[PDB]
Every structure is written in C-alpha cells, then in structure tokens.
Design a protein around this ligand. Structure first.
Ligand SMILES: [Mg+2]
Ligand SMILES: [Mg+2]
Ligand SMILES: [Mg+2]
Ligand SMILES: [Mg+2]
Ligand SMILES: [Mg+2]
Ligand SMILES: [Mg+2]
Ligand SMILES: [Mg+2]
Ligand SMILES: [Mg+2]
Ligand SMILES: [Mg+2]
Ligand SMILES: [Mg+2]
Ligand SMILES: [Mg+2]
Ligand SMILES: [Mg+2]
Ligand SMILES: [Mg+2]
Ligand SMILES: [Mg+2]
Ligand SMILES: [Mg+2]
Ligand SMILES: [Mg+2]
Ligand SMILES: [Mg+2]
Ligand SMILES: [Mg+2]
Ligand SMILES: [Mg+2]
Ligand SMILES: [Mg+2]
Ligand SMILES: [Mg+2]
Ligand SMILES: [Mg+2]
Ligand SMILES: [Mg+2]
Ligand SMILES: [Mg+2]
Ligand SMILES: [Mg+2]
Ligand SMILES: [Mg+2]
Ligand SMILES: [Mg+2]
Ligand SMILES: [Mg+2]
Ligand SMILES: [Mg+2]
Ligand SMILES: [Mg+2]
Ligand SMILES: [Mg+2]
Ligand SMILES: [Mg+2]
Ligand SMILES: [Mg+2]
Ligand SMILES: [Mg+2]
Ligand SMILES: [Mg+2]
Ligand SMILES: [Mg+2]
Ligand SMILES: [Mg+2]
Ligand SMILES: [Mg+2]
Ligand SMILES: [Mg+2]
Ligand SMILES: [Mg+2]
Ligand SMILES: [Mg+2]
Ligand SMILES: [Mg+2]
Ligand SMILES: [Mg+2]
Ligand SMILES: [Mg+2]
Ligand SMILES: [Mg+2]
Ligand SMILES: [Mg+2]
Lengths: 46, 114, 118, 54
RNA sequence: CAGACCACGGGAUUGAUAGACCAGACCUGGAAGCCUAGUAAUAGGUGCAGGGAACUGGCACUAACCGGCCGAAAACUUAC
RNA sequence: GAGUGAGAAUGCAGGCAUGAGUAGCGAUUAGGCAAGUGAGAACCUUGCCCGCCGAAAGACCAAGGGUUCCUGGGCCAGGCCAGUCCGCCCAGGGUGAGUCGGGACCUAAGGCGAGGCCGACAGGCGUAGUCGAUGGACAACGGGUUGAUAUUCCCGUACC
RNA sequence: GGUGAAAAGUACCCCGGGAGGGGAGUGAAAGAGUACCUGAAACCGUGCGCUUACAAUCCGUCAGAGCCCUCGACGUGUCG
C-alpha cells in the first residue's frame, strides 16, 4: 500500500540545492543565472 | 394575423434539449392551461419556461393592452446558448471534458378570438 | 405486520426497524407527520398495532409497546389519550393522504394523521 | 464494445424521439372560493388545504 | 402468487381490493403480574399461557375520491 | 512578382456532432420528524430521537500550506444534484513573550575554505578558521478573559 | 484585438428573487446594447409544402404517376 510520491517539499533543502548562493558559488550556476536573466524570467532561482 | 406579444429568456442554465422536453408539452395552448401544465409537471426545466410564458402574457397585459384570457402560446422554442467547458479527472491520469450548456427560450403569444 | 417484500426501507433491515419506531413516536407525539409515500404506507400498520396495544389496558400491553417504542412520554400519552380515544373505533385509526412531490429528488410525499372523528 | 460507425440522423432522431414527457392530467378544485387545477392524485389534499396553490 | 419499466389480471361505495379489528388454522413453547417452596441459583401454580407475518372467514373502521382524457361511416360497377 | 489552388500526411489549431440524455455521481456509519428561514430547502439553522468512531473518525504539534481563521455580506463560476450553505466570492478585522520554539550560546556528519599544495588553462583537494541540529547548556506556573491570540494579555504567586 | 462619429452605454414603466426580456427613449443604424464591425460552414431548433408504417435502399442516376408553386395563352379550367 505504499503511496509515497516523488515530491516532498522542504523549503530549506530546496534552497540549499537550488538556491541563489549555490548557483553563484560555481561557474555553470552563474552561467544559468545569467541565462535566465537574459531570457527574462521573473524568478532566476529558487 | 393576430396581435402578438414576445418574451425571450437567454443564457438560462438549462440544456436546450432538456428545455424542449417540457416545451413540447405546452406548445399551442392557452396561457393559463400552459401555466397549469408546467406547474404540475415534474421536470425542473418547467421553472424557466413557465416564467417565460408568464412574462410574455404580461407584455400583452401592459404593452398591447389586450385581454388576458384570449392569449394562446403560438410559438415557443429553445435555442442553444454558449457552452462552458470543464474537466473531470478520470482513472489512470485521463481527463474527460464536461459541457455546461445553456439555452434561449423564445415565446410569442397571440390574442386569438374565442 | 407483513414484512417488506422488496429491499428494506432505510437501506437495511435494522435501519427500517428504528426508522419505523422513530416515525411512530413522532406520529403519536404530534398527531400528523409528513414523510415519503412508501414510508407512510409502511408506518400505517405498524403504528396501528401499537394503537391496538394502547387500546386494551394492561401492564402486559404497556410492556409490549415500551419494548417497541422507547419514549416514555409517548407511552404515557398513548395509554392516557389515544387508547381511550379509540375505545369505539375498531381499527383504521390512521389516515394517509398523498401530498405534492418533493423538490430535491422528486420523491412522492404523503402525510399520515390520526383520525379525530370518532 | 465501441460503436463501429457514426450513427445516422434518421436513426439518432428515431430514439431521441422516445425521450419525452407526458403532461399530467388535471382536474378542478375550488379553494377560497376560486377555482384551481390540480392532479387528481392531490385532489383530497387540496380539498383540506395541504397543497400550496401559489 | 402479474411484474425490470411497460404490459397483464382484479377492485373501486350498487364496494371485502388492501390495511387495521375480531375469530380460526398455524409457529414457538408455557408471557408478564401475583402467590407459593427453597439460604439461594431456581421450581410449581394461575394456564395449551403469551407473542406472532404471509393462509381462511367475518367486519366499511381507513383508503379506493364533489374526475379528467380519448373515442362512431365518401362512393362507384355489375349481379341481385 | 508569387507565402497562388487540399480531401486524405494515425497532419496542426479552433468550434461542433456520434455513443447519449447513456455510464457514472468516489467505500465498507444511517438517518428521521417537528419547527424556522427564505422566491425557492432531502442537503442550511434549532430542538428531540436514531445510529457510527472512541489507541479515534478525540486532543495537541512538527514539516508542508498561506489567510483557508473571525465578523458582516453574497449566491454568477466551483461543490460530481439543489443550496438560503460552504475550506468558494467580497470587505473589514485578527497572531502581543526576559522564561515557549529558534537566533544573539556550543559543536556532529558535512559544507565552504585566508594563506596552501596540486593541475596546460578551466579547475581538485585542503590547513587555520567559519558555518551547520536531528544533539549539549540555559530562567514560569495555575486560573480568567476575546467573535477571532494566549505558559505571550490580565490576576495570583515565582525564577533568571 | 475591432460598440458607435460621439457613451449619446437604454431615464421611467411592466413580468421576473435575480439573470433575461417587453414598452419607452439614444443613435444614421440597437439586422451597432459595453455577450457589442462584417457574421460563412459544421452543429441545433421552429413553421409550412410534398412524401413515408408488406418493406431488403454505396443511398444515386434514367424513366415516371399523383400532389404543390410559379410564368404565358386562350379564357374562366385546359394546354404550353
Ligand atoms: Mg508497493
Ligand atoms: Mg415546476
Ligand atoms: Mg492521479
Ligand atoms: Mg476524453
Ligand atoms: Mg422477503
Ligand atoms: Mg434485489
Ligand atoms: Mg437504494
Ligand atoms: Mg444487528
Ligand atoms: Mg384496470
Ligand atoms: Mg389472528
Ligand atoms: Mg411466564
Ligand atoms: Mg384476512
Ligand atoms: Mg375526440
Ligand atoms: Mg373512400
Ligand atoms: Mg500554399
Ligand atoms: Mg479543409
Ligand atoms: Mg484531416
Ligand atoms: Mg480536433
Ligand atoms: Mg450528443
Ligand atoms: Mg446503450
Ligand atoms: Mg442501461
Ligand atoms: Mg446508473
Ligand atoms: Mg460521496
Ligand atoms: Mg421543514
Ligand atoms: Mg460502537
Ligand atoms: Mg477504549
Ligand atoms: Mg485528532
Ligand atoms: Mg470559516
Ligand atoms: Mg451558485
Ligand atoms: Mg451546483
Ligand atoms: Mg452567510
Ligand atoms: Mg465563510
Ligand atoms: Mg527579563
Ligand atoms: Mg569542519
Ligand atoms: Mg584562494
Ligand atoms: Mg574543499
Ligand atoms: Mg551557529
Ligand atoms: Mg534541536
Ligand atoms: Mg483559536
Ligand atoms: Mg494560561
Ligand atoms: Mg430614434
Ligand atoms: Mg447598418
Ligand atoms: Mg458572439
Ligand atoms: Mg456582430
Ligand atoms: Mg405501403
Ligand atoms: Mg433481392
């Protein structure tokens, strides 16, 4: 009777895996942020 | 020809084919007979159509100024109206469509001789 | 009296029994109730046999009706008013009259009352 | 099973025809000195004032 | 006791069609209250008791109504 | 001079039929009556019954949600029916801490990591450090109050 | 995406709980009513005309009785 779906929300973990600071510390993340800014997203990152 | 009065009810939240099923009961009858038939008929679509008939009678009361008792429901019909579309979710991720249908009931009554 | 022939009235056998008991309690309390037509047709004989118990005055009959009804104010009013009221009527204490259909499910409605002529 | 062919207008209208209603048979009663029409089923209940003649 | 609905069959006050009521057949098995015996659980009496649906017969007490809708005819020819 | 001609590409979009007024209307609890409200009530309000849960189908939280909470109003859409009702729509209101749960205290796994070493470059690891609770340290209890908060407000008595 | 030139966006009255309409007004127009230029087809009705319930129909085509409408003529109903 297992019915556990894949998405389990957690605000802190979502921040520490997808957040602004983690996107910035690396190089591909800064690329992603610049790309999203150029596209026009109102939300660059989690 | 005979003097006539009209009444229209649009965007009534009743399927056209479910309005016609009680419209077919009262076509070509005296207004009072039609109102009685609708008042004792056990289908909900009677509530709109009855009102429409009564409305038409009042017009002949108040705009043609003609005799209440000579009125006959000469023409009555139900046109389709706009349909809203909704979704009912079904088994295994299917999503089926639902139509919320409407109607326009039109009545013309005439003041025929006795 | 004779059982229900088809499926029992309240959805099961035990619900029909309690349903009848509540309907009879309300009928004896108010003297007139409005319910659905099949419920009224089932309540007529069941209520009339309780009235027959109340017509004949013994502790044994009072015990039978308390067995079936479970409301002591209604038992008192049975044996104090309704039993004596029908001392000269031989059966047929009730009256079912059909009334206008319901609106939500278009259920055929009816009214049961107690006869007040003799 | 599933319909093999789309069904024709004659055959559609043939059994859409059976989905009709019948008008109740009315009789006359006198309440408050004025005449009204009610089903013969509700005749008594109108005669002792338990149906609401609007 | 006819039946998915419909149909079918019976009755509808000039009436026993169904319910109630009274009685019977039947089923269970000896009600409650009282009295009594025994410390008691319990047993005996009152007493084939009490309860009770379908079956039968009585009985208009209750409903079958101060009711609506349908529904009846060209003629012609020859023989007679 | 051509974005120049459609009936087929299990073609693309939109609108609409057929099935069809058909299946279904989402558990294993079950509702009834009297009264009220209202244009309208099986479903709303009140009473009296009946029933179901009761190591829960009760009480309180974390995570997650985000105003759904309270009051007044509403009834077009939503509610698998109707709705006067609603977790729905609208407006206003509502969350009060020295002691509760965190930070200003401490660290674990781990993360990042001054200088650093390694690596053609991009980078990889990492020292000192500095973060990081799911743990350690650290002082408040009973009663009352609002339509909506309560070891928070108030009352009584405390502690750091 | 498109009311109209301009909101002049339907005062007031009537039926309806409202929604919707009917008069009255605005307008060149309301076959422009804030569901709004034009408003095709699919699809859905209503009214009338002819036909259809002994009949095996790729649903047409060719021949064709009867009925209905219309245009001429003579006339006054029958040809063309
Ligand atoms: Mg599994
Ligand atoms: Mg009605
Ligand atoms: Mg799913
Ligand atoms: Mg689908
Ligand atoms: Mg049985
Ligand atoms: Mg069965
Ligand atoms: Mg059922
Ligand atoms: Mg049981
Ligand atoms: Mg018969
Ligand atoms: Mg007997
Ligand atoms: Mg005994
Ligand atoms: Mg008998
Ligand atoms: Mg006739
Ligand atoms: Mg003939
Ligand atoms: Mg092209
Ligand atoms: Mg095409
Ligand atoms: Mg195609
Ligand atoms: Mg498509
Ligand atoms: Mg369809
Ligand atoms: Mg089918
Ligand atoms: Mg079926
Ligand atoms: Mg079904
Ligand atoms: Mg449900
Ligand atoms: Mg009520
Ligand atoms: Mg229990
Ligand atoms: Mg327990
Ligand atoms: Mg709980
Ligand atoms: Mg609320
Ligand atoms: Mg609504
Ligand atoms: Mg709804
Ligand atoms: Mg409210
Ligand atoms: Mg609310
Ligand atoms: Mg302090
Ligand atoms: Mg470390
Ligand atoms: Mg460095
Ligand atoms: Mg490192
Ligand atoms: Mg820290
Ligand atoms: Mg902790
Ligand atoms: Mg609270
Ligand atoms: Mg407190
Ligand atoms: Mg003008
Ligand atoms: Mg124009
Ligand atoms: Mg449009
Ligand atoms: Mg247009
Ligand atoms: Mg033929
Ligand atoms: Mg052949």
């Amino acid at each position: 009777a297992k019915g556990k779906r894949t998405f389990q929300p957690n605000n802190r973990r979502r921040a520490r895996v997808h957040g602004f600071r983690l996107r910035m510390r690396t190089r591909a993340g800064r690329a992603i942020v610049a790309n999203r800014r150029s596209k026009g997203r109102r939300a660059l990152t989690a | 020809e005979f003097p006539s009065a009209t009444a229209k009810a649009r965007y009534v939240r009743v399927s056209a084919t479910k309005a016609r099923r009680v419209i077919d009961l009262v076509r070509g009858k005296s207004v009072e007979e039609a109102l009685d038939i609708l008042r004792w008929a056990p289908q909900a679509a009677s509530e709109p159509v009855a009102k429409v008939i009564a409305s038409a009678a009042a017009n002949a009361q108040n705009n043609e100024g003609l005799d209440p008792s000579t009125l006959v429901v000469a023409t009555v019909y139900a046109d389709e109206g706009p349909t809203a579309k909704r979704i009912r979710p079904r088994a295994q991720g299917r999503a089926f469509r639902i139509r919320k249908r409407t109607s326009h009931i039109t009545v013309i009554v005439e003041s025929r001789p006795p | 009296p004779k059982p229900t022939k088809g499926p029992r009235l309240g959805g099961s056998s035990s619900h029909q029994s309690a349903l009848l008991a509540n309907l009879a309690t309300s009928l004896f309390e108010h003297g007139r109730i409005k319910t659905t037509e099949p419920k009224a047709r089932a309540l007529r004989p069941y209520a009339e046999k309780l009235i027959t118990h109340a017509k004949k005055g013994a502790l044994h009959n009072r015990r039978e009706v308390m067995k079936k009804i479970r409301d002591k104010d209604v038992v008192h009013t049975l044996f104090a008013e309704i039993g004596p009221f029908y001392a000269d009527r031989n059966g047929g204490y009730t009256r079912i009259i059909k009334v206008e259909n319901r609106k939500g499910d278009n259920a055929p409605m009816a009214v049961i009352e107690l006869v007040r002529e003799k | 099973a599933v319909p093999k062919r789309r069904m024709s207008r004659a055959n559609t209208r043939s059994r859409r025809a059976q989905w009709k209603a019948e008008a109740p048979g009315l009789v006359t009663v006198s309440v408050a000195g004025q005449q009204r029409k009610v089903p013969r089923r509700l005749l008594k209940a109108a005669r002792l004032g338990l149906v609401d003649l609007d």
